[PDB]
């Protein structure tokens, strides 16, 4: 099953301040009005990059795992939630379908319906990066029509090969990034505050 | 001006001759506060190093490096470098670094060199002929030796074959020195591979223990995790300066700003993509990099046949930056601000013109548009001419260029 | 500021002087254009204290001394019309206040003295007499002004009011001036953005090449950027030369409309605005000029029966100036641009030969004064 | 080496020919203006203010000059004015007379 | 349309875009000229029988 993404999944493409101005970029982005997959669960492919979002009340989702294998032979990427903060590791665990109860050959380690949180997970070959946003919403399962940009959380200098991912365990959503041009409007205070998916339609073009 | 026009006579006018450009008054650098310094000293101060056949390896990553903190100290019995000179290592970046550490007798330390042959080089730690890195060594007879001998510091005298470059191997087998079938037990012609120096405090220096660390480096397809020092200076505002922020080099006036960068934003840009502000990595400051002051320099002159005097216009410059006169066109220098208005002799800009006049000097003034004349209009008054002049007014128009032709094959090649 | 690039740039010889000369030529020509358009007046004529212009009301187009002392209509024009990487902008020689002194002088001459200030010393004349000469210049007899003077004053004043409303209402009207500003903004911004282009070199940031490469490689990569930036600058300078010739063709047209439509009255049909021309007033505007062309347009016609000539004693009478017309019953002659019937007489008309030769002649009487 | 000298000399010649085309278009505008002043100011009498020199135009004489033409515009300029009282019309018998 | 050249031509920057703007200026002006020459008339007058 599917749902309309409206104008969600925009993110700050570079660490640059700009003010009262329109800037153009081509990068991996979620298209406007795209079909995200509706959920309220299994292993999924990564393609070239992932958008993930959920309407969890109190950071309910326990984490994620990413890699080629997600089972031994090489370190898979592991990410875990502790309240407002995040634990990260890369390890060669080989668990069954309950990895949250399985809880290692590891080579990197780090620590950081009223609400909706949004995340972008991105390999860049110049290592791996994560972007996110947190917002209150109306008490509705479908993604509301609205605008904000996901901000960079971390750069992981890890070099892990990724082709699939899984969630560690309300409504939630998945979509995929595509190489697309976007026009980005910045307000006075450096903030991306409107955008156009350049390829969307002849008026947008 | 004579050299600008390629002539010994300059006719009356104004001529651009050069560009004024404020020089950088000093050089500035900023990078974050010195943090994540690589733990080389924590390896060097470890309580003991291994038996040299199974030398300790520590992987080093995600850190800034200054190897001169190590090699400047004459406290070691030796500090030597191979493939690269010690100073250069402070410039470099690497994906991984390794500290490789062990104990050897004072006579055998010579085997730690590029492409060596002998017990340690072939069977314990093979440095290749193209080894890039450094060797740190010191006497440890006060640390490692014991009465009756210490055996925690063995060396592999025997192995099947020579080790590969930087190879670590824990394999052991009994060496058959003769006809005896050894079959994995000690005996006559059946020597144990891990020989003991048996270190004692009374030993002569060639038998005494030496602790050694060797530094080994790699830069890979996976990008660097180690780099040289985060260089920095004081941060002088409100002067034109050469600068560098986190590797963004330039020259400009570093000015205070109210520009609210988001927490992750490092650099700021204007409409034409040109950089206009930066974060100081050593504070919370966002500084606007106003461009360093510059402009065309033009020389005002009467014709050289009449006088040699000259005056200068610093186009768009403020006279803080350069007889002086600030104008909307720039600084006049060498011309009098006479202010009383006249016909425009030599044009300048924004209503200023200049002339050479009487006791003689160059003067600059707001130009006159001609004499004022209030027409005596009223609802019943007319003026009628009672007489005329015929007049003859010359007008001149060009009609033809000089007819010119070029053979492109003869001009280009010939 | 790279010395390394500066030394390599010498190998291209005169190009980097030649392009700076070509822009200097364009820059000097802008003051030549502005002088040939506005500096046609010999002396700074001034408006009289009492605005006693026979009922006409120039207060919207004359200077407001309380304000740069522009007119009201000049202010609308200055309101509707709407980084330093080695580029420099330069000031115009005449400031916007000096242009407003010339458009004040040209206007105050045109109001108080007709064309005369454009042909010699200015001669004062009452405004309702100046308009009688300008009407007489279009084949409408002087008395058609005087018999309608308040009506003509109200039409002129009302029409000035409609221009003030029109220019106040929309920013889309000044397209010819706004496009000059927009084209130069696009040219300068494109010339700047081309600094960031790689031109097939390793980077467009010169400091990369100056720190990452040895001289023998850095020379090749810099020479790619020089080849790119130099071809960029030559293309911009060539477009500014072509655009300067396009604006010169408009400046010579404006200088010609200043000399003919302001300093005179032009018989060039549809040159100084549509309709028969009476006069025009210049108003200054940023990077340009605005003419308020005042024109007479005939507007409420009647049909008539007409004849090329009329017989009398077998001789044919032609109209001296004007046309023969009839209300079906009686024959009259009129001036041809405004219906005003005159009784046909031997001073209104001239004889030439006999009634045989003229095709389509008619009879009636010609009266003897 | 020859390919660099070709590219340099060729781009330099392209610049000259491009600037000569633009300069020749300015001279054509001047030659058409001269042919217009020849047609009106010499072969006629231009009733166009300040076209055939300042003042009211009478006639003009062309004179040759190297690469151009010189016009000697003969013009009438009024020169010694007197002030007068004036009126647009005058009565004689309740009828109004105009000049 | 051979992609290996297009991936190089992007590195030459604004050139191949501004040439379409320059030719569009020429192309629009051909209509403006033809408008100003012929469309001076206020109505489509037509000749009597
Ligand atoms: C020139 O600079 C000084 C010092 O900043 C300032 O006082 C003055 O107002 C400036 N004048 C102009 C015209 O920029
Ligand atoms: C203007 O210049 C004159 C000399 O030409 C001088 O007497 C006068 O004081 C000056 N006035 C000002 C306001 O500078
Ligand atoms: C008219 O002016 C000329 C000089 O232009 C003078 O010689 C002549 O005497 C004047 N005639 C009258 C009647 O004023
Ligand atoms: C002229 O126009 C002004 C407004 O511009 C108006 O106030 C004034 O009453 C009008 N009439 C006269 C005779 O000034
Ligand atoms: C003039 O006469 C023609 C033919 O009778 C008629 O079509 C036209 O409407 C008339 N126009 C006026 C203004 O009376
Ligand atoms: C005018 O037109 C009609 C039809 O052509 C004709 O009968 C009449 O004789 C013509 N009159 C003249 C003066 O040509
Ligand atoms: C005018 O009147 C004469 C007789 O006096 C007559 O012969 C002639 O045909 C008339 N002409 C016209 C055009 O009606
Ligand atoms: C005309 O009369 C006025 C007022 O008396 C005077 O200002 C003006 O100078 C006179 N002009 C001539 C040519 O006498």
Residue numbers in the entry:
A (entry chain B): 27 to 66, 81 to 143, 164 to 172, 186 to 242, 263 to 298
B (entry chain A): 299 to 620, 641 to 676, 689 to 744
C (entry chain B): 745 to 811, 813 to 827, 854 to 1140
D (entry chain A): 992 to 1090
E (entry chain C): 745 to 793
Paper's wording?
Changes in the spike (S) glycoprotein in these variants are under scrutiny because the S protein has a central role in engaging the angiotensin-converting enzyme 2 (ACE2) receptor to mediate cellular entry and is a dominant target of neutralizing antibodies (nAbs) elicited by either vaccination or natural infection. The prefusion SARS-CoV-2 S trimer is composed of S1 and S2 subunits separated by a furin cleavage site. The S1 subunit contains the N-terminal domain (NTD), ACE2 receptor binding domain (RBD), and two subdomains (SD1 and SD2). The RBD transitions between a “closed” (“down”) receptor-inaccessible conformation and an “open” (“up”) conformation that allows binding to the ACE2 receptor.
Three RBD substitutions—Lys417 → Asn (K417N), Glu484 → Lys (E484K), and Asn501 → Tyr (N501Y)—occurred in the B.1.1.28 and the B.1.351 lineages that originated in Brazil and South Africa, respectively. Of these, the E484K mutation is of particular concern because of its location within nAb epitopes, and it has been shown to reduce or eliminate binding to many potent RBD-directed nAbs. Despite no additional RBD mutations, binding to RBD-directed nAbs was further reduced, showing that amino acid changes outside the RBD have an allosteric effect on the binding of RBD-directed Abs. In the spike, interprotomer interactions made by the RBD in its up state, and secondary contacts that the bound antibody makes with adjacent RBDs, may play a role in stabilizing antibody binding to the E484K mutant, thereby explaining the retention of high-affinity binding, albeit at lower levels. For the triple mutant and B.1.351 spike structures, the RBD tip disorder presumably reduces the stability of its contact with the adjacent RBD, increasing its up-state propensity. In the B.1.1.7 variant, this occurred by modifications in the interaction between SD1 or SD2 and S2, whereas for variants harboring the K417N/E484K/N501Y RBD triple substitutions, RBD destabilization was mediated by RBD-RBD contacts.
